[PDB]
Design a protein around this ligand. Sequence first.
Ligand SMILES: O=C(NCCS(=O)(=O)O)c1ccccc1
Length: 345
Amino acid sequence: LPAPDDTGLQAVLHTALSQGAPGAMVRVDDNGTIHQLSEGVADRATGRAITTTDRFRVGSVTKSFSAVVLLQLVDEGKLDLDASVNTYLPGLLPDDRITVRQVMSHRSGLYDYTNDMFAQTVPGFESVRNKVFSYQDLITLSLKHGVTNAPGAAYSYSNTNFVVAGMLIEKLTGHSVATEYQNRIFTPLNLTDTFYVHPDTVIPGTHANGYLTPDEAGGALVDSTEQTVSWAQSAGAVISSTQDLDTFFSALMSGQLMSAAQLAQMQQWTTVNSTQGYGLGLRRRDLSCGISVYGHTGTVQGYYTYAFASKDGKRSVTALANTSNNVNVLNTMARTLESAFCGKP
Ligand SMILES: O=C(NCCS(=O)(=O)O)c1ccccc1
């Protein structure tokens, strides 16, 4: 790989601040040599600086954690990716043909209930932030709508799919998702900054606050740090750090979290666009310099994450900006992957 470009990374973070991120940061683990940069504030009211050791909400990166658990269940003979969801969760879905593999790859057709919840960004946050939902509650909200496509027919990202994932984990194991993440992932990898505390609203230890950008241009930011994340659960509620997400995706890609056979299944790509694919709770991004990287993005109120690794896991990158609902920031933060993997022009 080319050398990571720290001057380029610095420029990305500075641009993200200029676009409305209170703070932005990135950590690269380059085969044992660390790169770490941060700019701005973890708490914009107190002025406390952001740092790459601050814990944060990883949002939809959680899907990769849920996928690893499910794929280990496949390895153990407890789950068949081509079985119907309804074989394991009788009567859950309207269509018996929807399979586990389809759910994990966003090919199920299940309507994304969050389109109802977050039609208006800040009011929607205020509606959900202090609610506790069951998994079934969220599935019922989806099922108020028809499916959006036939089983397996089309990629359409939906949080509902990884709500199903959590229900499957809990049914098949008899344990909570927190227990399964701890025993299968957090403890074996020694992820000391990584937690699943749902429905607790506190982020343990020193953390970046999250700042939700309102829908009205120029509007005052809303502190969105403390919420249950119950609207997402196994689709979005993990807390982590840049170091720990780097460890996680490096361990995944290097073969440490499941059999070779199941990692290969995880990397069967469904086309998203001409430079992106979706596997089983895993994303592929094709970079300008002809490198692909593997991992997941995260969005949750007040936090944007990118966490990606090279194919052999030897280089991993995690970037965080502590805002959300700001597409300029979201797009800018993606440029960390260019600077970290492709290097200088
Ligand atoms: O994921 C959703 N919101 C949380 C991330 S952010 O805060 O909008 O950037 C979202 C989901 C469906 C419709 C609208 C929004």
